[PDB]
Amino acid sequence: RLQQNGSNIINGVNMKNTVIVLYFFAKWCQACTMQSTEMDKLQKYYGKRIYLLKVDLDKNESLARKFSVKSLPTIILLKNKTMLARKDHFVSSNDLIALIKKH
């Protein structure tokens, strides 16, 4: 059971090739709460055209460390396991759309 799986996206294994939005955050972090609100709009607009992965840094230093997060919020965009863009501070959903919509 739980057997190991293949890649269509390296982070989300065994499913699909879409644009995943990896967002690092912390509950205590005020700068984030404003962004999370943004992600909600972003999620609604793109629906399933993208996948949002929200990461709580407080619970995964391992990963943040791997991705070298130096601030919150951090937003990284990946398609086909190649980083498309990165933001190390707040971005608007509208801004997010624009960057995303390149692809």
From Swiss-Prot:
Domain Thioredoxin residue range list: 1-103
MF (Gene Ontology): protein-disulfide reductase activity
Post-translational modification: The disulfide bond between Cys-29 and Cys-32 acts as a redox-active center and is reduced by thioredoxin reductase TRXR.
Membrane topology: Peripheral membrane protein
Statement: the UniProt record of this protein carries the keyword Acyltransferase: no
Localization, UniProt: Parasitophorous vacuole membrane
Principal subcellular localization: membrane
Family from the record: Belongs to the thioredoxin family.
Assembly description: Monomer. Component of the Plasmodium translocon of exported proteins (PTEX) complex composed of HSP101, EXP2, PTEX150, PTEX88 and TRX2.
The protein's role, per its UniProt record: Participates in various redox reactions through the reversible oxidation of its active center dithiol to a disulfide and catalyzes dithiol-disulfide exchange reactions. As part of the translocon PTEX complex, plays a role in the export of parasite proteins into the host erythrocyte. The translocon PTEX complex is a multi-protein machinery resident in the parasite parasitophorous vacuolar membrane, responsible for protein secretion into host cells.
Name this protein carries in UniProt: Thioredoxin 2
Organism per entry: Plasmodium falciparum (isolate 3D7)
Source species taxonomy: Eukaryota, Sar, Alveolata, Apicomplexa, Aconoidasida
Portion held of the full protein: 54 to 156 of 157
